[PDB]
Amino acid sequence: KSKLPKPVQDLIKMIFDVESMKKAMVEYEIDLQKMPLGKLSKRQIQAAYSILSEVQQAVSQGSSDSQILDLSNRFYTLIPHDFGMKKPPLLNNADSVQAKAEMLDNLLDIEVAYSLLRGGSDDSSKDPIDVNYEKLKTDIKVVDRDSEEAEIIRKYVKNTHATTHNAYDLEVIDIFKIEREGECQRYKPFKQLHNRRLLWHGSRTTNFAGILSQGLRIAPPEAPVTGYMFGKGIYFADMVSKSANYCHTSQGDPIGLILLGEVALGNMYELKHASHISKLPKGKHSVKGLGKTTPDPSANISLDGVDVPLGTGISSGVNDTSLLYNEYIVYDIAQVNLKYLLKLKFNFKT
Numbered sequence: 001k002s003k004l005p006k007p008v009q010d011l012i013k014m015i016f017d018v019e020s021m022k023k024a025m026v027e028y029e030i031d032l033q034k035m036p037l038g039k040l041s042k043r044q045i046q047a048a049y050s051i052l053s054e055v056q057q058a059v060s061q062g063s064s065d066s067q068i069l070d071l072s073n074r075f076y077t078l079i080p081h082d083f084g085m086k087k088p089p090l091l092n093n094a095d096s097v098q099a100k101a102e103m104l105d106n107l108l109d110i111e112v113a114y115s116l117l118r119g120g121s122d123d124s125s126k127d128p129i130d131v132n133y134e135k136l137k138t139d140i141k142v143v144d145r146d147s148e149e150a151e152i153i154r155k156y157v158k159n160t161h162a163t164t165h166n167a168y169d170l171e172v173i174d175i176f177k178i179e180r181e182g183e184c185q186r187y188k189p190f191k192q193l194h195n196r197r198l199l200w201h202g203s204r205t206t207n208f209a210g211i212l213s214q215g216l217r218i219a220p221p222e223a224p225v226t227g228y229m230f231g232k233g234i235y236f237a238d239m240v241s242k243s244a245n246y247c248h249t250s251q252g253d254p255i256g257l258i259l260l261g262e263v264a265l266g267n268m269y270e271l272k273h274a275s276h277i278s279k280l281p282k283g284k285h286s287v288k289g290l291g292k293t294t295p296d297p298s299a300n301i302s303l304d305g306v307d308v309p310l311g312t313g314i315s316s317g318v319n320d321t322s323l324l325y326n327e328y329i330v331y332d333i334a335q336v337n338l339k340y341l342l343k344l345k346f347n348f349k350t
């Protein structure tokens with residue numbers, strides 16, 4: 001029987017929950033009778049993505065109604081959808097392409113999770129949970145509840161939970177010290193480069209199988225740039241509440257997963273308003289979206305030479321900005337080193 005601790009075993013159960021993969025698809029209005037979990041492949045999802053780029057150029061080239069109608073059919077043939085009595089929305093507007101590209105992004109993540117869970121060498125001797133743990137190529141360890149690094153993490157959660165995000169209440173169940181294979185050796189050329197910060201990253205439970213097995217990825221240059229507030233890069237926050245909104249949780253499923261990563265920011269490009277470009281000026285290594293509220297810099301500590309902005313939310317003094325809270329963006333995967341993984345309970349205030 002399994003040699004992993006119960007929180008780690010329950011974590012594997014979350015990451016590889018077939019019902020949560022199915023639940024996510026039904027939300028995206030995919031017909032499960034026509035498109036089951038087993039029948040979806042990376043070949044057809046990547047083929048549906050190529051059709052979206054054909055839709056993109058058709059709009060730009062002002063193609064006929066027939067060309068637009070063909071592509072909509074081509075797409076809905078590869079990715080069947082259940083709208084019931086409702087007519088399928090035509091792929092013509094830039095927001096339609098944006099919506100379907102965001103759906104295909106999350107659906108490719110579900111495929112990677114299912115391909116891993118089903119695939120691999122079938123051995124009688126080893127435990128299923130122990131085999132699935134191996135597939136992630138990540139070292140997962142339970143952080144002691146009354147340790148100093150646990151208290152730093154709990155203070156970071158308590159202090160950086162904003163007042164505007166008064167919809168829920170965050171509670172830490174377990175803290176996991178994660179170590180992705182080769183991520184450290186890859187991070188090494190940035191490992192001493194100034195302004196390294198411990199930042200938050202919230203995502204859907206379904207994405208976590210791919211995040212641990214591949215690491216936070218930068219969007220394909222094929223995808224539309226419109227949806228990216230600060231271009232195609234890896235986004236983070238210094239406020240837990242901002243990142244926790246990306247966990248995609250409800251009263252039904254109040255358990256979510258969030259990350260803490262060592263982000264080598266370097267010389268940041270401070271921006272007040274959105275720029276969909278992913279190209280930085282000379283000497284700039286990251287982007288700092290200036291928010292109206294920042295954690296008190298006087299309370300900034302240094303856990304293992306990395307800045308932990310665990311201060312209470314105070315006014316930044318930034319005049320005329322679109323952002324309420326700061327967001328940090330890196331345009332190189334090698335600038336990230338995932339250090340922790342948190343299991344949070346959202347206590348939805350009603």
Ligand SMILES: Nc1ncnc2c1ncn2[C@@H]1O[C@H](C(=O)N2CCN(CC(=O)Nc3cccc4c3CNC4=O)CC2)[C@@H](O)[C@H]1O
Pocket residue numbers: 105109200201202203204207208209210211212214215216217218219228234235236237242243244246327
């Ligand atoms: N290797 C990977 N396998 C599976 N999913 C992966 C992955 N790398 C990233 N993802 C996940 O895909 C998604 C993604 O890239 N996206 C969608 C979101 N979009 C904007 C964005 O990052 N916004 C944004 C802004 C501020 C904070 C935070 C976020 C997201 N999380 C936060 O804490 C950027 C492109 C995202 O939800 C991420 O968690």
